[PDB]
Structure formats: C-alpha cells, structure tokens
Amino acid sequence: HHHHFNLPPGNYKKPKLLYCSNGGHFLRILPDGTVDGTRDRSDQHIQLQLSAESVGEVYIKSTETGQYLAMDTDGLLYGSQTPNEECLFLERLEENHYNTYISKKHAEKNWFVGLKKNGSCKRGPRTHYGQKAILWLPLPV
C-alpha cells in the first residue's frame, strides 16, 4: 500500500452529492464528459452513485448520465462511458472527518480528486496531502 487505510463511515446505499469546502462546489460530470464544480444544488449532473469494487475502492458514477469519474494519464478528470482502471478511486477518511479520493492507477504519485476555489478541477500532479482542495463531504441528494 502507498496509502493509509482509515476509512470513512456511511455507505453507498443511496446516491450522494460530493461537496468541496475549498470553493464550496459540488462535483459535477457534464453530458459531454467535462468535469467541474458548481454551487447550484438544483443542477442535474451533481447526483452521484458510489459503489465499492473492493473495501475502500470505489467508482463514482453520474446517476443522470451513467458516466464514471476518471483521471487520465496526465492527471485530468473526465467522464468515462465505461468502467476502466482510471475510474477506480481509493476512498479514505482525512483529518478524521472528510473523504478523499486517490486515483488507484496513479496511487504511487498521490494524485487526488480535487477542486480549486473557483470550481475548476485540479490536475493530479498539482494535488497532494494537506490541501483543502482534496477534502470532500458526501451530502444527501
């Protein structure tokens, strides 16, 4: 393992919203595959369904479009039509409260799912432990 194994509570029984306190945005996966953040709670593309492939490993999927969150070889987030190795994330507890999602494929490089204060996605290499951009809070739909 390249990372710790503290896991958050809760489960995957219901769809969730992923809220980033960094800028105060909900993770959004647009129909065209674009990924970003939005402060609009009524947005139809922020509803996500998480599922566990293995303990601590998850897929994050758009309930509206069916697309899977994924991080490409250059660290950019994108919506994938099908599940592949770039769609698996390590879901962990952080600061004894939040949820962090580390790219499983690039786990050794410490690439996290994260949003900047302006709601734009952070590129993998620009993220690291200790940032506010990587801290998520799952919220009911």
Q: How was this structure determined?
A: X-ray
- Contacts (Cβ under 8 Å, ≥6 apart) of 69: 27, 29, 35, 48, 59, 60, 61, 62, 77, 79, 80, 87, 89, 113
Q: Report the candidate in 84, 138, 96, 131 with the shortest Cα–Cα distance to residue 112.
A: 131
Give, in degrees to the nearest 5, the angle at Cα 108 between 70 and 87: 15
The neighbour count for residue 78, using CB atoms within 10 Å, is 18
Instruction: Report resolution (Å) to 1 decimal.
Output: 2.0
1-141: CATH topology is: Trefoil (Acidic Fibroblast Growth Factor, subunit A) (2.80.10)
Listed by start position, the domains of the chain span 1-141
DSSP string, the chain: --S-----S--SSS-EEEEETTTTEEEEE-TTS-EEEES-TT-TT--EEEEEEETTEEEEEETTT-PEEEE-TTS-EEEESS--GGG-EEEEEETTTEEEEEESTTGGGT-B--B-TTSPBPPGGG--TT-STT-EEEEE-
d(CA 60, CA 68): 6
Ligand-binding annotation for 22, yes or no, is yes
